[PDB]
């Protein structure tokens, strides 16, 4: 039932790496402060997403055993998970509790950010399904690690090596779900089910960016490697 001492340490190490990310309030502060034009919002997105990828690579390199994977398979895991990790982190930020009325304004700012109408409704559906799960910061960090270490990405040559890195994290996440929510014995499965919804965003992410309601879609060199754009 309990976490073993090694699992506590593992969880204990992953949270520290996860918290190197930009603080949620830094992000929601900028958005809530002024309304921006769709062009300024696009720039804010590419700047945010470039910083996010940089930190995600440092987080990924600290995952136990990742650095002993074949070098081509390491690239394939990062490329295959970067967009999913960005939306999971966006959902975490969106669901942070804020002073009265702030989340409504944040939703309106995002609705009016320049993103295409086609995409606003699924995005909020996913954010809202993520908020219903009442995840802790440890659960977000673990889920991000599990997303990154997915053996079923393309071009993974040695899935079996990746599986043995993913499984200890799945075991810890399952123990937390039983501890943190013993009345809901479907909670672990529901977290894992949300991952399949994340994968759909990865598959539409290019069109989501190019349909942004701006005249030019300029991406940074790092984002062009990670995203299927330009």
């Amino acid at each position: 039932m309990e976490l073993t001492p090694d699992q506590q340490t593992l969880l204990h190490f992953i949270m520290d790496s996860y918290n190197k990310q930009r603080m949620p309030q830094e992000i929601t502060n900028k958005i809530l402060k002024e309304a921006f034009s769709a062009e300024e919002n696009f720039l804010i997105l590419t700047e945010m997403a470039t910083n996010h990828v940089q930190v995600l690579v440092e987080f990924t390199k600290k995952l136990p055993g990742f650095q002993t994977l074949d070098h081509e398979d390491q690239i394939a895991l990062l490329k295959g998970s970067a967009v999913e990790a960005m939306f999971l982190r966006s959902a975490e930020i969106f669901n942070k509790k804020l002073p009265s009325g702030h989340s409504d304004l944040l939703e309106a700012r995002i609705r009016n950010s320049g993103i295409s109408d086609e995409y606003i409704t699924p995005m909020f559906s996913f954010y809202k399904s993520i908020g219903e799960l009442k995840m802790t910061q440890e659960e977000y960090a673990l889920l991000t690690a599990i997303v990154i270490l997915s053996p079923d990405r393309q071009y993974i040559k040695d899935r079996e090596a990746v599986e043995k890195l993913q499984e200890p994290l799945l075991d810890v996440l399952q123990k937390l779900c039983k501890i943190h929510q013993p009345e809901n014995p479907q909670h672990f499965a529901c977290l894992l089910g949300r991952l399949t919804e994340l994968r759909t965003f990865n598959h539409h992410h290019a069109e989501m960016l190019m349909s942004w309601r701006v005249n030019d879609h300029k991406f940074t060199p790092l984002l062009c490697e990670i995203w299927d754009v330009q």
């Binding site: 690239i75 490329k79 060199p221």
Partner: peptide, 11 residues
């Protein structure tokens, strides 16, 4: 081709 990524992975 994935050079910036390959670079950040090695540094």
């Amino acid at each position: 081709d994935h050079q910036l990524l390959r670079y950040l992975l090695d540094k």
